[PDB]
């Protein structure tokens, strides 16, 4: 066999890559894959159902597939687990209650033996109130470091400003690209 | 070159500050 | 509320006229020059004039004053910035300010009047936008001007993002006669030429002495800047919450922000100059300049402006280092130095003749006027320390900068 | 970093010389780049002092500290704001990020006699981040 071809396409770029969307309602999701892709605060309703969109940085084609957190949509995100690469977890660091509840479905999304070589994406959304706590404090309280074999990478990102996006965009990169 | 001083690269934020 | 803003001539003919709201007669223009003649042959010539109930407040261009006339009790800083705005305007769109282009360019001269303003009302002043939509050489407007984002056009493009700063330093000193300076005041300007792809948002970041302060680092070297006048793309709320520096570059050269704070240090020049002026026999300058500044800059194109007398004739220089030339026309010694070293030490001995016959009336002592630019040299110590360029595609920016000392009103008074 | 190695001798001669406890101008060096010391290097900074030595257990004092960070920005280019330590009374922790130095005590604040000691948690931990939050923004 012969790999010229891939070879060419490699020399100015062929690796694209995957991403996933997933958190709660009203947890800043449509709006950062709105941010992420369009580059504006883009009001929507909460996402009844899901939303795919694709993101091109760094010669990397990033498609992201956002899923909302509704209590009928929570069970569905398994059907987005298959043929997937990567997983973007958005935290809602202004609903003390809806933390704990955020914090169960993450244990129990990462309980899956199929999503094994997805690393884990902790974004911190809702970065514009006082109430909003560090970049350790959820960290801590979510025990992402109780997480073996996972690379998990804490970001905090603002959704009025959009800071922070092109930092957990390079680490993405990062984790999932291992060359120079 | 350049009268009244050469131009100078800038950096993009105060990494020290984190 | 100006109700008719018109330009005029150095000979009283008014060059271009446009009526905004016509609550003035057209031929009030014609009071106007001889009520400005009589004020300035009685000392009572102002910028603001006032023809009975119509008051002509303008300012006076390269070759011709720029009259807006007004009836009510209109804001005269509004008017001053309307024309403030307008001679900016009429500079980007043409190179030089004279008759020879108000007679040329009269086309696109009527439409940039009737666009600018609309009842004495301004709506558009930025000269790269009100490039799109009226050209002297239409289609739709430039959504800029509806949007929030009236500095920065979307669709810019270009094949490298280079952003050139410009720290430039204007040392003003207000030294007595008597040895001792009283206004020492520096004033920062940092003007940037943004050339990049798209409506970057940089993040500003300098080693201010407040922003240490918060931040906790108020121990090295910090700029105590009393006042900071950011642009118009700089977000005011940004600045004032946690001196956050956030605006959108513009396509070209403008001021971001403008420092301004006393200075409380040595002088970068100290002239020690005598007068052995002769009562109508001779006349003697013992003046030595000593440079207080670091050895390590130079004052590239020093121009020590000394004041000479009117009458005098016959003048000979015996001087150290630097060119010495007396101007007629500016009736004073220009102490000329293409290069001085920090640290360096002038030394002259004037000598000129003056006639017996004195003179009818007095002339005054003009201060003498040091002309020092010594660049890669800060001053204030003020060093940039990040600039955050963020743009919604991705790409890497090289942004570059400079800093120049000069002098700014840095006058030494005559005895 | 050949440049690193030979200032590493002479500047810690120069700061065992100043006890622990004239030109005037602000000159610039022409094309030179200026920036704030990055966490990356920072930690090679510390690591290669560390292996050096001559940093570890010398006692603190704010002339050393100064020429330290005046020959760090020589030799580098980096701003000297970096080298900060946190408030006392007692352990200081590095401002910076991925600082592994840090002032411990050795016997107010002022009159405490400090010594630098290597801290590897220092690149990992945020101590000085977390200690004061406000600072860190
Ligand atoms: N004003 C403001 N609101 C925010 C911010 N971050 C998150 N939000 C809230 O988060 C919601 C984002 O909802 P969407 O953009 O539609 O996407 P989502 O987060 O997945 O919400 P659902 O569609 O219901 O799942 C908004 O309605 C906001 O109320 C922020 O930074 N500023
Ligand atoms: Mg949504």
Redesign the interface.
Known sequence: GNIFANLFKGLFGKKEMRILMVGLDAAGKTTILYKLK??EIVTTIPTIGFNVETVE??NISFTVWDVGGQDKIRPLWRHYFQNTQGLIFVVDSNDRERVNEAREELMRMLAEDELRDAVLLVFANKQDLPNAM?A?EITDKLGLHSLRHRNWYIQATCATS??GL?EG?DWLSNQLRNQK | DRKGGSYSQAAGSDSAQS | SASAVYVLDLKGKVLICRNYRGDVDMSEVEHFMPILMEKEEEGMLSPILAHGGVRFMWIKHNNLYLVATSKKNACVSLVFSFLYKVVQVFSEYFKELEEESIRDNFVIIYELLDELMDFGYPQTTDSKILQEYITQEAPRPPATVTNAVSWRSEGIKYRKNEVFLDVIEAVNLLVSANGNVLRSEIVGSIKMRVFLSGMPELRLGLNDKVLFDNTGRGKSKSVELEDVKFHQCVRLSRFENDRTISFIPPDGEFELMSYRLNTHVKPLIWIESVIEKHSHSRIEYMVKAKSQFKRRSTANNVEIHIPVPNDADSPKFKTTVGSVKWVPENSEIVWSVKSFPGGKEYLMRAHFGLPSVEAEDKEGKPPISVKFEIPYFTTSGIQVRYLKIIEKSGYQALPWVRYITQNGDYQLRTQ | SKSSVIGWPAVRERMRRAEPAEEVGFPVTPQVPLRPMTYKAAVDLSHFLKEKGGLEGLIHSQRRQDILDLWIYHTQGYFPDWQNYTPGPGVRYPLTFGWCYKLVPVEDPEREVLEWRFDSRLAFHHVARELHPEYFK
């Open positions: 369009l580059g940085y760094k560090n350790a959009g800071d092109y965009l």
